[PDB]
């Protein structure tokens, strides 16, 4: 429960979101696992990438094997039959045709394998990068671990390949509001420390940048710099001071 709290603190979301809604997130995550359960079990088209590795490899061998029944410019395709039918003084010419015709069929397959094996290393190094960042930590690269703000990931094995289970965070429902980038109280700007200044129409509010949670503007909420004419978009307000009622009693 605290390891989750360390990970909401990396997307600009304060700690109070998690423990105030610990039951909704738990059921949302448990239902998310069940969606992967049905999606993997129903259709077999999800494993497209790992299937094409075997089929491309199996197509290379069957091409290579079927090349052994070709004359390649000679009169036959059997090593034993050409020796019996034709004299060895002139069978060497015919068996020479079953050298270049078969040696060139092997160097073609080897060259295709060396190029194809460079693709896998470029994908094995990318998978090693994800297992070092997306599993052993939290990543701030946008659209690296799934579309959205990232939380964690889990690795799973596969036949000649690896399968990840990313866990992202996506906002759902938005609301219109009215904003002003600065606040003026005593002829001076009142830039907020962390967040923007919003108003529903009557009272201005300050809130964080990814989840609606307004607060009354206080002296702790803001830092002051400059006068009240340079900034464009200024809107007046009153910033309450917590010290004066506290010092009153």
């Amino acid at each position: 429960a605290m390891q989750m709290a360390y990970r909401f603190n990396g997307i600009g979301v304060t700690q109070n979101v998690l423990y105030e809604n610990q039951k909704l997130i738990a059921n949302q995550f448990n239902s998310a696992i069940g969606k992967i359960q049905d999606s993997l079990s129903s259709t077999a088209s999800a494993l497209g990438k790992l299937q094409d590795v075997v089929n491309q490899n199996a197509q290379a061998l069957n091409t290579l094997v079927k090349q052994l029944s070709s004359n390649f410019g000679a009169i036959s395709s059997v090593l034993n039959d050409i020796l019996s039918r034709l004299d060895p003084p002139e069978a060497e010419v015919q068996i020479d045709r079953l050298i270049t015709g078969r040696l060139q069929s092997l160097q073609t397959y080897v060259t295709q394998q060396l190029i194809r094996a460079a693709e896998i290393r470029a994908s094995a190094n990318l998978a090693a990068t994800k297992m070092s960042e997306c599993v052993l930590g939290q990543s701030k690269r946008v659209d690296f671990c799934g579309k959205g703000y990232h939380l964690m990931s889990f690795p799973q094995s596969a036949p000649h390949g690896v399968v990840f289970l990313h866990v992202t965070y996506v906002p759902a429902q938005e609301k219109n509001f009215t904003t002003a980038p600065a606040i003026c109280h005593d002829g001076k700007a009142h830039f907020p420390r962390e967040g923007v200044f919003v108003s529903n129409g009557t009272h201005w509010f300050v809130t964080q940048r990814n989840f609606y949670e307004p607060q009354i503007i206080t002296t702790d909420n803001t830092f002051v710099s400059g006068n009240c004419d340079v900034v464009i978009g200024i809107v007046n307000n009153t910033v309450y001071d917590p010290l004066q009622p506290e010092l009153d009693s």
Partner: protein
Amino acid sequence: GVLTESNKKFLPFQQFGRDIADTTDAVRDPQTLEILDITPCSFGGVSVITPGTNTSNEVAVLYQDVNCTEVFVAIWRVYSTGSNVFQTRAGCLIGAEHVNNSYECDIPIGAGICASYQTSQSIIAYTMSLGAENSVAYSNNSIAIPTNFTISVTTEILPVSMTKTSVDCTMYICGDSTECSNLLLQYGSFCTQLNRALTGIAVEQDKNTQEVFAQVKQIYKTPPIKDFGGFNFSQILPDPSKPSKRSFIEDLLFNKVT
């Protein structure tokens, strides 16, 4: 080729022209001083546009890089040379009909044309729709903060290694033949070089599965107290029912691969 009249002007001693890639295109007629050109006859690839054979039984051919007049010549079926032939920018399409609507891409054809199977029912060839459009209400005084969130789980699948394979160049070229074994050797070190190249791949595959997985120092143990604050992790952790430590989601992944 296809002879035609030409507007090119030769020189009064000149016989026939050529091109950049040393190809003959302009030939002067011997008797008459008229100028003739050369155009190669039409050719291209033949493609078949079909839906799933489980669903329907109707096809539509696509003759590529050809004007829609040279069709019906061919040389299959005779019926596939009519029925509202529709010209595309990538070739001549026979067996489909033009629609003024816009839909998502189903089968690529070329130059922004997609075929599908829609309802009675036939094969259509529309222009793809680049998603649904949108417009944001931008202003100098507006802001939008979301009020509720979601947690989702996607899936990313990558390959790590292929199957290690070694091929003996001695046995493959000359399999148990005294005359062939000696004649192969005088070619030199072709056989020796190939068996050293395929060893470099086979060593590299072990290194690939070492870097992706073996990044942990000590094997850890799953605690027996599974109180994880509400989260249910039993679907991904190992299940002691099988003799192996294979989990449940891994079990489906192995069966889907043939």
